[PDB]
């Protein structure tokens, strides 16, 4: 039997064709941001071949 912390993926979750999860950024966005436009410029998720370790505790099937 194996429950996979549904919140682990209930936030930042997907496996690119290579496998590497595209994590995500955030920091200021939507919490309180006013200052610094470019800073805010956010982008679109990446990884940490340093944390993808744990960031893998989950996984299971090709879901969405």
Partner 1 sequence: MRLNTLSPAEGSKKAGKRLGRGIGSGLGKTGGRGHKGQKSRSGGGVRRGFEGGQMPLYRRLPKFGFTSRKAAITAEIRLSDLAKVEGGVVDLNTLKAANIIGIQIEFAKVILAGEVTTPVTVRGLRVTKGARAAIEAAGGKIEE
Footprint of RNA (CB under 7 A): 1-7, 9-11, 14-17, 22, 44, 59-64
Q: Is 9 helix (H, G, I), strand (E, B) or coil?
A: helix
Exactly one of 2, 11, 18, 41 binds partner 1 (CB under 8 A); that residue is 11
Q: Does 15 bind partner 1 (CB under 8 A)?
A: no
Within 10 angstroms of residue 57's Cβ, the number of other Cβ atoms is 10
Helix %, strand %, coil % of the chain (to 5): 15, 5, 80
Q: Does 55 bind partner 1 (CB under 8 A)?
A: yes
Exactly one of 4, 26, 39, 40 binds partner 1 (CB under 8 A); that residue is 26
């Amino acid at each position: 039997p194996k429950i996979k912390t549904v919140r682990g993926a209930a936030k930042r979750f997907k496996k690119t064709g290579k496998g590497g999860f595209k994590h995500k950024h955030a920091n200021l966005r939507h919490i309180l941001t006013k200052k610094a436009t470019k800073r805010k410029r956010h982008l679109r998720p990446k990884a940490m071949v340093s944390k993808g370790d744990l960031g893998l505790v989950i996984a299971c099937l090709p879901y969405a």
